[PDB]
Subunit: 480 residues, 4 copies
């Protein structure tokens, strides 16, 4: 049994009536409870994420099955049985908060690992590749996919114009327009690091690594017609599903695998191993099991924990480092940059974002300083032995630079179509039909020249792929 | 034929590639175009409206048919044929930005008139009454209706708990759970001022006024089943419809009517004429035609114009004033208050929000001062005749206060159930069945005590209304 | 012995060198430590207070000597010997952060009492009256006093134009241009509540109250010449003095007195007892001792505690209420309003601003939500007995309204000049000469018409006062 | 003759009285004019600059005397007689907005050139070198200099601790503790680019460049005692002086010179030519005259134009590029970064920050979008020939990279003391005495070990320099 109070701690006498001139008169300015209560209501909302605005979160645990110490010194991977707390957010990409979870889109798969050497964020998607290979293009890509800036409705003519003129998108689109473009929910879904990263071991040796999450629940996808039927009755079915699984004790889980590749394999491959439009052959670079993540606890407050959660690919830990991937390189900047705006300069103090590991440094102040700071010394070097100091046992590697000059230049061996053809051919006949069906419904109303260029990009990937699409769209491509 | 530039006006050499160490190396910090482009993309989003987040805008014109100078000195209403430019936003209420337009909700109907004596905002809804009668309850009402703060899903058990314990809601719920709770689109839809306002003529004489918008396209609604079938294929059908009507020249329009009531009618009535849970009888207070509003122009940019548009019931013009309605009194504060947070201290300089009438005053500075201010004099009184001065020809009326103490107290004659019964009985048999159907689908899963109290509130409105709902829900109300 | 870390908790290997292409090349974007550190440095600053920007804070304790339960139910005043923690900020008014503490100005004297029934802020100044009597004028007054908006330099011509046309300022200026317009420091300085407030006892009986703080160190002032000599060497001497006193154990203190006046004394006085340009006679309404406040602890961090401190006159507690004073009435709004902009929606969770008393309500979210909220119920009324509820034992009084219309109208008996004459005549001859000296150095350069009006205002206060000022300025007052 | 209005354009009836219950009653909430006016007053302030908060601005014109086309393609320098509008802000560094202009500090000298190929900012200081050579140290350096985070008072013990442990500071301190550490005002003052930059001509040939501004009014400095006497009577004398010069038609001016150095001179030198702790010999690299800048117009509004002005060393134009200077490299990021926070995402639309050159790109939205955007196409590549495209005639150079790994490593040939000795010996005997006097008054109270290390750093620069300082401080340095 508790009092309603103001934010000043004064108990509230009447939470029903405003203060007025008699029982039915106009309202007085001297009503601190009314003004405080409205003013805070008036300030509840903060900016949604610029992409991935729609999402849901859960906590759980990651457990190591096979220590990875031969390949990385990462502390959270050092020993069999080692357990690390995680927070995870899943999401769509393009549409705003409140938008349906039945739309075609990659799905976000962002994992925060609270390790003893700092927080490690692996900010993944379900699908293992991406549309583009340079971050400079990201606002363009996003602008083309987002609702039209005049009508506020997504328009295939706009994103197909971009994608067709950005032929490195061809492999991505060959995945996205399979039925795996609409996962059934967040649990029955793949996860992927997408980028090549660098793993560095106790001897300073480096390997390239890729990450894969495989669902215990299996993968399940929705046809366009199954997606429509769900959309009719529930625009939030994936959010609902994730919460409910966990509430009922049916905890979803994923096994983590890696692929590893020596740095020297660059010069022999017919693609760039740090091109995020590429996968690595599972025959040549087999999946190796690392451990299992199980999600087992819903957050206590959606806004405080899921909405305010902040992940960044640049939250790396010793033993794990960026690759040269130019898409990745831009992300290192963009996430903490956007988060300082979306959440405040001190967003890293918000509880879900805090490390378990100790934080000590000489940063200070900023909007909403809540942490009770003390001390006279906020600079280094200083004469005081007890104040925080650098620690040379934790230095990153020093990657070798193969280039001679500061350049703006596409990577060599872009190879935009080959893997797209390999993927196409790996599909079963039923999967190939769904792909063509999905592509056709998306392309049928797009401007003719762009329609043709899309067909030609897919034709370059595989002649049967492109021909089928052309036949299904009524386009005669015999002159070419 | 134009150059791409930076925001500093420097032409861009390469909008495709980041600046790197050779063609495949890591990225350099000295890439102003990359950082500027990403940093602005990272800051595109602002907070959505705390309610009515989903919506769509258009411009048009209002034309007077019958001059209203006998009852109000309002300049825009002074002459037959007088035309005033408007901007209008329509909206849903509860769910966020990308949410479907097929959900049950009141619809917002906000009209900004750009008059020669200032901007006049009539911030209406389709339905003519409201759930509550005091602004102190608005955050509670909203919190109950919004998605649950843990699960992020709306829960009828939550809002029914609030509404049943707020029996003044009974009239509103009787409208909202008719099929008018889901308008077919924004054109085929009623509009209402909801509140009683005061009209004051040039002699200082005051009348109570209510506003009504009647659609030229007629009113049309969706059953739950028709709403689902639309939802399956389009989660923005009403946004689409409004744009498309206007693009194809099929301009939607609404006629404006008023009702007028002498102040002295207060004692003649068994309810409070400034209680926004109440309508006025059209027999006793007939609709009088004022004019017609036609919407004929889509905005050029949805974010700059529709998203950033700011309406407030406190944007009143000479001749038009607030009533004592306690719900209204809170709104006078809340709208500019939230807008200063949502849009900035200087939101009134954003183009859609700017008046056509001249603005001159002594306010200054604030975030994003873009208006090229000049002059040494930013205070009044001052000794300079050419500086802006108050003008005593534009004073508001001085309403009489009947109460003699500052109190927090419910209005006399709340009369929470009578008009709800009158509405119920005014429904056709088919409308009554839809109401009971809609209510039953919403109530069938809520907690048993709350379910019973709902039935009792509707029973107090009308015995048949309540009995039908009880029978349909399998609740035995014979002991009461 | 501690590691320097990133905000993610990763130890820092090198806090001296940026990451670069060889030992002397350009810098890489993949340097999370560099970018995090700079980005947080780039965001250290928040807006300064719109007035009273320069100031200093300390903590201490207030101890009751005479219990006040006969006149107020205020819990912190209920018993002899009862101790309440305080936080206090002292300040100048007009110039920005960083400005000298040797300038002429009122001094702020803001006391936050952390009481068992909520925080009580008494937001005072040293001087016991104010320039103006209506909050609508405050931005005008402040704009006139502040540096000129073109030159960034304060201009006596500007504020004397305002003040002369605002003759209710005459009493204030007669205090401010004594040498008490430059206190020697914050310890040897008066405090005042300025406004009349209402004290309400357990029986519901109300008295008017005024507050006075009397320094144990005595009151001491600086002549213009003594101020200049200090200014030459120290532009923060008062901040320095306060800190150093407390560090050396020489704790400054003030005794609190009140005056009490029956409500019925309105009608027989020749001024309005709620006009903040007026004092109450100490002969007719004697000072009654309440207790002593001692300041004994410096804050641990100036930004987190003093810069972010938030006081409002509307932070009232049961037994202490606003008066009708129209200056006060505007302050009730303005302080929490500016603080939400200056500090954030959730400024009340910043540690110095937190109550000791429990806080429970249904407000939620907002920028920087750090309080780990939980629970499904964020609305009232609700069906749960354990959730926070209103408590009717804590209702404010219901002041009687004498007026019967909503009006914009000056108070009756403004009496602008009488107390200014009484003050003048209460000065010793030496104090009178300092006043005329101080006034003359301020007025000598202002425009001739405004100069004359100032003389006339002070002449209306007292003929000798005005004649002396005229003589000293070389102004011929014979025509008038 | 004009009306006072609200921001809605409604004329104001009464700018003197709040709306109240009778002439002496409490205030009503329905007073839009009061609430709008107070609310905007409450939001006037934005964050001050994190450094250089105190400053003053003026506009003028730069005129080329000698065309520089042989060394740079910069358009504003291409022809004799070519005139370019400038905006210039001068400043102190460490203390806040209202702080005195008589304090020891470098002075900022920031020039914005509104060129036909974009805005070019040359963000200089009076003194030609800096304390540090890597941006990673800047927040440390600044934290040490700034008022103590507990006391709010600057403490020489704190910055001398940092500086003595950062011996690269030794040259800077040898300038700063001459009397040129307190310029007499902003007109009689040097300007410097500080960094080496790269100039690139139309053939792609690169030279290193340094910039120097020489005042037509000559250089004048203040002794500590002269600075104290001015401080006593005016804490804004330099802001006053600049305005007054320009108001009286006495326009200050500076001639611009450069030094040029071939890239191949790197091996010829015993220091790194891109180390900002170093100058270049005027004998070996003579000053070459470019043109003259005259300041001739005060701004119209100090807040709108000076306070909201935004400069960045990264606002470069074709023909002018960064060097590899690691201090510079951090600055490229930090200025726009801080500005987005201080001013808003759209700060580049604030009138003073706008280019004269056309701006066309695909960025959109952000807080306070006032630019009336239109169009469906906000992405590139796109199929439309009329939309903005990259232009390959405006590419930056491609500087050669000498290093072959990503490293964190001090430059070779830091040479921390030699130029400090050369500067010392260049002083006249009177200048040497003022240096020692100034140093002694700053050092006499710092901790003994730090005091000794300072003496040793200056001794390493020049034995006489260090001996004199030691004698003056009573420190016996026999034993070293
Ligand atoms: C209508 C009249 C007045 C208005 C509109 C007004 C408004 C304000 C505002 C906006 C602030 C900044 C608050 C913050 O950012 O935390 C402030 C500070 C202050 N005001 Fe006033 N004020 C008024 C009259 C007075 C009076 C009469 C006094 C004393 C009796 C006073 C004493 C103070 C003090 C001491 C502070 C600084 C509190 C602190 O240390 O943070 N003001 N005022
Ligand atoms: C790594 C070294 C440095 C860093 C991180 C740094 C950072 C900053 C920042 C963040 C600002 C605020 C800018 C704004 O609010 O718009 C600033 C202002 C300034 N800095 Fe630096 N700075 C550095 C070195 C220098 C140098 C070498 C100079 C001169 C050569 C200098 C001169 C200035 C000036 C003049 C301003 C104020 C510009 C204005 O008037 O608006 N700084 N600095
Ligand atoms: O993110 C995407 C969603 C849907 C698409 O059709 C293409 C991209
Ligand atoms: O705004 C509302 C929407 C749906 C409801 O069932 C009740 C209120
Ligand atoms: O606050 C004030 C300072 C100086 C003045 O001359 C008047 C008021
Ligand atoms: O920036 C500075 C200010 C004061 C000092 O004594 C030294 C440097
Ligand atoms: Cl740090
Ligand atoms: Cl104004
Ligand atoms: Cl705000
Ligand atoms: Cl509440
Ligand atoms: Cl930001
Ligand atoms: Cl762009
Ligand atoms: Na007529
Ligand atoms: Na007692």
């Amino acid at each position: 049994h508790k009092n309603l109070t103001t934010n000043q701690g004064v108990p509230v006498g009447d939470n029903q009536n405003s203060r007025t001139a008699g029982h039915r008169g106009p309202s007085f300015l001297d009503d601190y409870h009314l003004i405080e209560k409205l003013a805070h209501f008036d300030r509840e909302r903060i900016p949604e994420r610029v992409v991935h605005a729609r999402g849901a979160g859960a906590y759980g645990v990651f457990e190591v099955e096979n220590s990875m110490e031969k390949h990385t010194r990462a502390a959270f991977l050092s020993e069999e049985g080692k357990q690390t707390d995680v927070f995870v957010r899943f999401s769509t990409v393009i549409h705003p908060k409140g938008s349906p979870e039945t739309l075609r889109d990659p799905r976000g798969f962002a994992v925060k690992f609270y390790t003893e050497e700092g927080n490690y964020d692996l900010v993944g998607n379900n699908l293992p590749i991406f549309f583009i290979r340079d971050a400079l293009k990201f606002p363009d890509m996003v602008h083309s996919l987002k609702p039209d800036p005049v009508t506020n409705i997504q328009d295939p003519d706009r994103y197909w114009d971009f994608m067709t003129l950005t032929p490195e998108s061809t492999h991505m689109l060959t995945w996205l327009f399979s039925d795996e473009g609409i996962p059934a929910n967040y649990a029955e879904m793949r996860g992927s690091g997408v980028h090549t990263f660098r793993w560095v071991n106790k001897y300073g040796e480096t390997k390239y690594v890729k990450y894969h999450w495989r669902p215990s629940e299996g993968i399940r996808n929705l046809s366009m017609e199954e997606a429509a039927e769900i959309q009719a009755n529930d625009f939030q079915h994936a959010t609902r599903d994730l919460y409910d699984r966990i509430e009922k004790g049916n905890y979803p889980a994923w096994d983590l695998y890696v692929q590893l590749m020596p740095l020297s394999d660059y010069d022999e491959l017919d693609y760039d191993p740090c091109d995020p439009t590429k996968t690595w052959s599972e025959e040549d670079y087999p999946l190796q099991k690392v451990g299992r993540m199980t999600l087992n606890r819903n957050p206590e407050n959606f806004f405080a924990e899921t909405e305010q959660a902040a992940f960044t690919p640049s939250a790396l830990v010793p033993g794990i480092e960026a690759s040269e991937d130019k898409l990745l390189q831009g992300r290192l900047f963009s996430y903490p940059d956007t988060q300082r705006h979306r959440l405040g300069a001190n967003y890293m103090r918000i509880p879900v974002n805090c490390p378990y590991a100790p934080v000590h440094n000489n940063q200070q102040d900023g909007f909403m300083t809540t942490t009770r700071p003390s001390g006279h010394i906020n600079y280094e070097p200083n004469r005081y032995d007890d104040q925080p100091k650098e620690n040379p046992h934790y230095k990153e590697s020093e990657p070798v630079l193969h280039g001679d000059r500061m350049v703006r230049q596409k990577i060599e061996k872009p190879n935009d179509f080959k893997q797209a053809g390999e993927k196409y051919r790996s599909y079963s006949e039923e999967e190939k039909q769904a792909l063509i069906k999905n592509l056709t419904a998306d392309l049928k109303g797009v401007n003719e020249k762009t329609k043709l260029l899309a067909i030609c990009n897919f034709y370059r990937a595989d002649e049967d792929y492109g021909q089928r699409l052309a036949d299904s769209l009524g386009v005669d491509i015999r002159s070419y």
